[PDB]
């Protein structure tokens, strides 16, 4: 349900995104900070995917910098989002009538980015305390959806999945398929370490990297050292 959305970590896995286009025509595929087509060329860190289900007309509310009921009481993306978005109109599965999809309706103040609020306590809209019983100025937060068929697209159920993946390649874990050639040294060679690209001469090095401390950098802020992924050596790019 939208008010308690799941979240699943992805790690240590060659991840392709070719497969997912094999779906019913996505009602939405936006990608906010990276083009969807070139998603098999990058190595990420800690890809995170978290999912829920909402109503039709509210799908355009899942985007940075918007306001509205879902966006301020149930789920809020931050302003500098960096990830993709999917939604694909499940009405063959989630409608019969169904009444175990829930969503919040009242709250004191808006959420904070990427925060889950799960509590079910009586909302108190007044100055006088409630003793856990509904009444005047004493309501219940949640409400059911009731997805019956033949409500038209506006009120029809909708699955949603959002991917957020931080994009500076700290020690990389998840990235798409690509072969691996034997590395050559002391020759001007096109290289592509884990996601970098460019030409240089890869040599041996004397620097010492801490276990968390993966690629070095220089004054003008350009990569000039790198931990080779398979054989964890330290190289110098010139």
């Amino acid at each position, epitope marked *: 349900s939208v008010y308690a959305w799941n979240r699943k970590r992805i790690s240590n896995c060659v991840a392709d995104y070719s497969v997912l286009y094999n779906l019913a025509p996505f009602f939405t595929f936006k990608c906010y900070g990276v083009s969807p087509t070139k998603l098999n060329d990058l190595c990420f860190t800690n890809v995170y995917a978290d999912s829920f289900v909402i109503r039709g007309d509210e799908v355009r509310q899942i985007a940075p910098g918007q306001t509205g009921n879902i966006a301020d009481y149930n789920y809020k993306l931050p302003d500098d989002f960096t990830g993709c978005v999917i939604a694909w109109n499940s009405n063959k599965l989630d409608s019969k009538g169904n009444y175990n999809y829930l969503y919040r309706l009242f709250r004191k103040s808006n959420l904070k980015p990427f925060e889950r609020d799960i509590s079910t306590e009586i909302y108190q809209a007044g100055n006088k305390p409630c003793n856990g019983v509904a009444g*005047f100025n004493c*309501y219940f937060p949640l*409400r059911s959806y009731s997805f019956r068929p033949t409500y038209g697209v506006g009120h029809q159920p909708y699955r949603v999945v959002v991917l957020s993946f931080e994009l500076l390649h700290a020690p990389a874990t998840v990235c798409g398929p690509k072969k691996s050639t034997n590395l050559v040294k002391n020759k001007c060679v096109n290289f592509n370490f884990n996601g970098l690209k460019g030409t240089g001469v890869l040599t041996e090095s004397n620097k010492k990297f801490l276990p968390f401390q993966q690629f070095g950098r220089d004054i003008a802020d350009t990569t000039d050292a790198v931990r080779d992924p398979q054989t964890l050596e330290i190289l110098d790019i010139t």
Partner: antibody
Amino acid sequence: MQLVQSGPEVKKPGTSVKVSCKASGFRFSISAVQWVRQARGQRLEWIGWIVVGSGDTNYAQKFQERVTITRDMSTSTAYMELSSLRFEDTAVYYCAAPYCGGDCSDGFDIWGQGTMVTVSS
Amino acid sequence: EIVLTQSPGTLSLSPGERATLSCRASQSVSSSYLAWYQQKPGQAPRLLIYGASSRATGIPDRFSGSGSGTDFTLTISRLEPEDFAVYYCQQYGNSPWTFGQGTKVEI
């Protein structure tokens, strides 16, 4: 801060009537609206109340097969329908809601001007 | 069903005097919800003392209200010629929410 009600209207017995309550000047997404009928020179009588956002209703036992209190967020109004009118239903119908900005006012201190309906032939 | 018996029926002070009313109840009602109202003839009513002790906004300090449990009173300090109306007492603690009978204050 005010409620504006519909206008006077006379019906024949057996029909049904629909009354409406405007809302303007405050935050309506939290409040509740109740309906009170008063005949001429008599006491006040209760009918039922509705919470706006949730839509839940509650009714008096006597008014159990004749009232459908529904609202509409879009235009910010609350409606009431009375069915199978009889001679005893001729009175003045009021509409009240707490003042509610950030917090509600713990008491119905906004009262509409009241509308009249005469069941005659 | 809560039944409220507002007594006395009619009270007849001269202006400048001290007035009292009553809302004796059948069972007990939470003091959280009980309100007095003032109904001028030909008007909608208005809210005087909500919550059984607190005055509503924009109301002269003459009106007090008090009491809990099953007895609640409203006292007007001095009677000026615009306080002559009919006063109702309404509980909305538990369903149904029911009113009083009225109490006409005259000259």
